[PDB]
């Protein structure tokens, strides 16, 4: 894979617009599923399906739960960074 991080700013609804998928105690590896239209993540053209996320605003997500990561991004405001891995 290729380690990469992009600084995407939050939208009006405090949602960069990006889906993920992961578990816990077996599948702690969180990854991206797809993107939504009219979203900063889509319009920007950086983070989307195929790219595995492994960081946010410098923090580490490789180990957290789906609900944990989701709330993490929703909590962050402004220039939100996402360390995705091109696969």
């Amino acid at each position: 894979t290729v380690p990469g991080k992009v600084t995407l700013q939050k939208d009006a609804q405090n949602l960069i617009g990006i889906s993920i998928g992961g578990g816990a105690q077996y599948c702690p590896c969180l990854y991206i599923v797809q993107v939504f239209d009219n979203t900063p993540a889509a319009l920007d053209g950086t983070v989307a399906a195929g790219d595995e996320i492994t960081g946010v605003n410098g923090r580490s997500i490789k180990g957290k739960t789906k609900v944990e990561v989701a709330k993490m991004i929703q909590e962050v405001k402004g220039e939100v960074t996402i360390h995705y891995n091109k696969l």
């Binding site: 617009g17 889906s19 993920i20 998928g21 599923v33 609900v67 990561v69 989701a70 709330k71 991004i73």
Partner: peptide, 5 residues
């Protein structure tokens, strides 16, 4: 299932 944020 896919949590969107």
């Amino acid at each position: 299932e896919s949590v969107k944020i």
